[PDB]
Amino acid sequence: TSQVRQNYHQDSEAAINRQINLELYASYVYLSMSYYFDRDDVALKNFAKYFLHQSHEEREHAEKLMKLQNQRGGRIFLQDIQKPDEDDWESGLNAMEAALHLEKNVNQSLLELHKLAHDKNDPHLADFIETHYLNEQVKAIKELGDHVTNLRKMGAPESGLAEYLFDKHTLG
Amino acid sequence: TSQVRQNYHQDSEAAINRQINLELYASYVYLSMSYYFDRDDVALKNFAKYFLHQSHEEREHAEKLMKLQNQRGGRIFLQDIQKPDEDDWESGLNAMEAALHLEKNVNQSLLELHKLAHDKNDPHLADFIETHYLNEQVKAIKELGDHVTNLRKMGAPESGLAEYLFDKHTLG
Amino acid sequence: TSQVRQNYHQDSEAAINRQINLELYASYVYLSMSYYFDRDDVALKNFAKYFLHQSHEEREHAEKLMKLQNQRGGRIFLQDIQKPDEDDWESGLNAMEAALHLEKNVNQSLLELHKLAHDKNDPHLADFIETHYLNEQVKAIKELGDHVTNLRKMGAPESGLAEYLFDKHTLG
Amino acid sequence: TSQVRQNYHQDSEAAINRQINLELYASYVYLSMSYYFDRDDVALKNFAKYFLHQSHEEREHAEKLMKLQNQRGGRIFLQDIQKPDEDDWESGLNAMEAALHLEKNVNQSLLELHKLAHDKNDPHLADFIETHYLNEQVKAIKELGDHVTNLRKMGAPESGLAEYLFDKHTLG
Amino acid sequence: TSQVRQNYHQDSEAAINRQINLELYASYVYLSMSYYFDRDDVALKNFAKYFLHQSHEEREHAEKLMKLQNQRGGRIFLQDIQKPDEDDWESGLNAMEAALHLEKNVNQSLLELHKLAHDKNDPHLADFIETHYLNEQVKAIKELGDHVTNLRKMGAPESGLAEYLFDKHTLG
Amino acid sequence: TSQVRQNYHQDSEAAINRQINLELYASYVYLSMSYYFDRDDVALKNFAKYFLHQSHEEREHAEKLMKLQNQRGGRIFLQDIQKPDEDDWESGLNAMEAALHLEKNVNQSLLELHKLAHDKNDPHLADFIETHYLNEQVKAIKELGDHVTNLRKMGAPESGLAEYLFDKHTLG
Ligand code: NA
Ligand code: NA
Ligand code: NI
Ligand code: NI
Ligand code: NI
Ligand code: NI
Ligand code: NI
Ligand code: NI
Ligand code: NI
Ligand code: NI
Predict the structure, then answer these.
(1) 20 to 30 A Cα–Cα from E50, which one of A169, D19, D166, F41?
(2) CA neighbours within 13 Å on the CB side: how many for A1?
(3) Distance from residue E39's CA to the centre of ligand 2 (Å)
(4) Which residues of B fall within a CB distance of 8 Å from E120?
(5) Which CATH class is domain E1-172?
(6) Rounded CA gap, C107 and C103, in Å?
(7) E137 annotated binding-site participant
(8) Considering only alpha carbons, which residue of chain A is nearest residue C145?
(9) Whose CA is closest to F81, among F15, F26, F137?
(10) How many of the other CB atoms lie within 10 Å of CB of C169?
(11) Looking at chain B, which residue has its C-alpha nearest residue E70?
(12) Is residue F95 classed as helix, strand or coil in its secondary structure?
């Protein structure tokens, strides 16, 4: 038992570790998307920059979660970061939809973790997840939905010119 | 066959992918060290910052390798980033020695890759590894050896005061 | 025999002269493309500026090669700069593909020259070609491949509007 | 027939193309002189810089002529740029006299072209050649004559010290 | 065996030590030339400054070589710095020719060392010598050859006025 | 006999040459110490910087002595710079004591040279040695004695932590 541990259950520690691993997996998937849009036959630099920024944001998420785990007295247990389920993300709209699904899964996991923290009578972790992630994930999901809608309203993926214009005007 | 592929063997592509995975593993190990020195019972902030910077440098290494793979016409195939073989790095000198061993392994892998590139008559990748990694890895190994020597000449790990002074004066 | 000649074979001198002539031919082809996109019935100013910049870069390449020839004690022997095999480059995508083929030919010639220099035990010229041209040609080939991919993903050459948009957004 | 062609004869177009080729040949000869004065056994850097600047000026001349050809509705037809008739320009005074002869030949060609334009009732091309080249060629010929006179009044080519002093004080 | 030694043969270490001693000898010869041109009966200050700068450059060469030896795990073994074979360097052209011969000998030694490093499969030391010395020695040899040519084209050593003018205009 | 020689004995010239050789030997020993503290198993950067600065100061001493020799009409005769009697300076306190002994020997040589100059009725060289070296050597000996005392009052060489603290706080 750590000297700084106070009102911190072991289930919350396991959930924090699992969310750390989930954020690592999300950053891995975002990096995979970024360097898939870096290929010569794809040639979409703005999508690559955006997905690299998203991977860095998920890295910051994981770092903040590990710092919070070290603060609450819990111990960190890292696991194997699984590779993305895909290596060729087809087009831009497919990558945006996959990122939207990943963000929704991360949001569901964060909501389950906050429900657990509320059941554990842990207001600190509750408000931490509320102010540091919930609104962030909501904004990210809204932005990805807007991007998917704009890509569908232009002819993608059937129109590569539409994806080029979305790379230039929107993500540029 | 890519339209930009020219004097680029498939063995070189596989070696580039394996080196990308190795750099990812090195960054993972460095992040594990950094957040192991972030624990409350450890309390060494400068070691954490240094290992986080090393993890970011290995991330930049992997990104540059993936960019070079995309330039030479080869395709990227990511794998599962294995977790570090340890979760408790004992003390500071043990972590420095483990980082030294990891750097020496990465240097051996880079030397084997350069030998392969020379056997494939690929001067571009050869000089790329020469100017972008070889001297960098040599400097890193020399710095880690100096750190290990200074830690051994102060009483570490038997003297926690020595590790504190090395964290304050050297890595501070 | 020059007083400054040292570890410099005559075959390397002939190869340097041939590469100088090749760079001159490449600059001539780039200037031809630039002023073909300057015609009234073509009207693509950004393509003209880009090809003029590429011609100036090949001119700098030839000047650096002649300076290196004067440094290594060898003598320069200039030949007739052949005219481009075409006077009407059809459209923009055709010109980009021709520039890609020319860059790949120049890269193959540089790789053969570096192989010869390695067989002549000339590390100076080897590293010179490695650091001053190899990565440059790789970047140029990658950029031309990205341009060709973007032109093919927009409707060119069947869509002149696509070529206009590529001239405005990309090369503008 | 171009939509912008107006009062522009085909003979004027052929003369413009021939003058473009002549300016290209002049730039080639100037570059040959510049890199002949770059040799180790010659060692005259200021002469090399001056001849390189003259080659760049002839390149600008050719570019302006091609732009004027594209403006007047005519089409450009490039030919093979012949190599200079010499590869060893003896000394500095010989190179200056050869440059003077080349400038006088270019001036004669420009005067013949202006006479043709006047016979074709083309005042635009006439005044263009008058204001953009005639006075320029006159100034260049006067400067080359002054340089030849100063080189002859110092002992060149029989005095290499005279050529060194002309490189240092005059062209420096 | 050092903890940082990796892919570093003992023959390469001996060659590095011998090259360190050679650079020390070159710096000694350059200092001897500099302070020979400092004598009252000689009175050539610019030659003294130039040779002192060359001696300092050879000192920096030796320091960089010793730093590289300390980096690659090898141990440094210094020897006796031999005095220059001459104490009166006759004139300026003789000193320039002696410096040219010394630079050519150092270049031959560096080329032999790079050949040895390539035979030892050491790309790090190979590229180090390539980028940090080879082009530097080539530029130095070219500059010394140009200086010798200019001194021979002015009347030196039979004309002390020529040496004075070379000291004032060139090396001044 | 030089035209500028006046009240300058040949014994004073020989003593000046011997002192030049002694300063060269001192600079060599200081450089050896500096690059001995540069080794990986030593790892003391501040000691290396201090000894390199001392070597540069002895180099300036030798240069000033050679300039004074050229001023007084005497001729310079350089000899072989002997290597240091040691290649492994044990620890920091041993190197400081060796530097102190070398400084005391140089001071004794300078005092003997000043006594000779006074016996030769040479006030110029006397006051030159007085104002340009005597107080400098006294300050250097006092500083080295203070360093040795501080190293002995901390536990060196039996305490490597003491040497590390002296490198950080004092020489840092
Ligand atoms: Na190289
Ligand atoms: Na006095
Ligand atoms: Ni996240
Ligand atoms: Ni790395
Ligand atoms: Ni080889
Ligand atoms: Ni080129
Ligand atoms: Ni012209
Ligand atoms: Ni008329
Ligand atoms: Ni050197
Ligand atoms: Ni001294």
Answers:
(1) D166
(2) 6
(3) 27
(4) none
(5) mainly alpha
(6) 6
(7) yes
(8) A40
(9) F26
(10) 16
(11) B142
(12) helix
